[PDB]
């Protein structure tokens, strides 16, 4: 399959080298409702006047970005997002900025975060969890082949589309790196031990995170948890994992290989790469090509009621979009 990835890389490189800029403007959209928030910045449901299409607009306050020292991270996010193209990755339609904010307009994925459905239902059956896992596996295979590291896998960053398929959003911590990196970033429950221990890490962290994800989906709770992050880190470092009695023998086997504290033994980081994962028994009944082609019938299809429907998202407190009369941090975000 190296053939496919090979030509996909040519596409990526072209856009990575010469990114698109300023492909729209704020007055072309009608701001409708906040779909979600994060460490900073919100995502709003917007409607494009000329086309009538609905999109999801991520808004970033330039000043907050600088305060939290996320300039480089924010620049990576946009540069990487506008260059990638994969069935399970959200599409960036437009990007632009003004005196105060940075804007990224993406396709609107109406199904809601996997998070909400997961918490509501409690947990997913293995066949259901496997369906989602396969899509992540292919996505990481694509991303890594481009020397990209995702670094923020979690149900909150995964969306369900109208067909019940996954759409990965939030490339806030995505980074193009050959070799190792050192930033302490991600989400506590999903941090790989090497990150916590500040040893310098690579793409292997994404595979560990997949382990945590699969576990959370099947169990209904993450493998390591507590009330304070520091308490969580201590458990992750220990590597001691307990499996619910309902977990299949194959699932447990796969998990012990992904949640492997030792990098030399962690699945995905070995000689056979992603194949150790794709060939594992738990995925025995998984038709990789069918998933890629989105020909598999989804085990769960979210209730959708026409375009613009946000019933699959929680409600958030709305707030004015402020645009100063003066340009803020112009130099810092020149390339954006």
């Amino acid at each position: 399959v190296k053939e496919f990835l090979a030509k996909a890389k040519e596409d990526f490189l072209k856009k990575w080298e010469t990114p698109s800029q300023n492909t729209a403007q704020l007055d072309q959209f009608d701001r409708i409702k906040t779909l979600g928030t994060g460490s900073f910045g919100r995502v709003m449901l917007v409607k494009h006047k000329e086309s009538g299409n609905h999109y999801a607009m991520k808004i970033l306050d330039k000043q907050k970005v600088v305060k939290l020292k996320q300039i480089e991270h924010t620049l990576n996010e946009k540069r990487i997002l506008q260059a990638v193209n994969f069935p399970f990755l959200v599409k960036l339609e437009f990007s632009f900025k003004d005196n105060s904010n940075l804007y990224m307009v993406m396709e609107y994925v109406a199904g809601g975060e996997m998070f909400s459905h997961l918490r509501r239902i409690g947990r997913f059956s293995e066949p259901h969890a496997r369906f989602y896992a396969a899509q992540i596996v292919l996505t990481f295979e694509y991303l890594h082949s481009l020397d990209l590291i995702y670094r923020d896998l979690k149900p909150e960053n995964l969306l369900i589309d109208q067909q019940g398929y996954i759409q990965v959003t939030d490339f806030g911590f995505a980074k193009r790196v050959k070799g190792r990196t050192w930033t302490l970033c991600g989400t506590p429950e999903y941090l790989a031990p090497e990150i916590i221990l500040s040893k310098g890490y690579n793409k292997a962290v994404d595979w560990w995170a997949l382990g945590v994800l699969i576990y959370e989906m099947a169990a209904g709770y993450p493998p390591f948890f507590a009330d304070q992050p520091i308490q969580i880190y201590e458990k992750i470092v220990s590597g001691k994992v307990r499996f619910p009695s309902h977990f299949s023998s194959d699932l447990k086997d796969l998990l012990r290989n992904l949640l492997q504290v030792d990098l030399t033994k962690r699945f995905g980081n070995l000689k056979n790469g992603v194949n150790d994962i794709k060939n594992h028994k738990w995925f025995a009944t998984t038709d990789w090509i069918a998933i890629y082609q989105r020909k598999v019938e989804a085990p769960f299809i979210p209730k959708f009621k026409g375009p613009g429907d946000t019933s699959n998202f929680d409600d958030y407190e709305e707030e004015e979009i402020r645009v100063s009369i003066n340009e803020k941090c112009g130099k810092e975000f020149t390339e954006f």
Partner: peptide
Amino acid sequence: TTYADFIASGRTGRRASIHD
């Protein structure tokens, strides 16, 4: 049960990313 301990924990809602 583990489930009951999790549900009673302070981290059952949406988790924020970190950049320490």
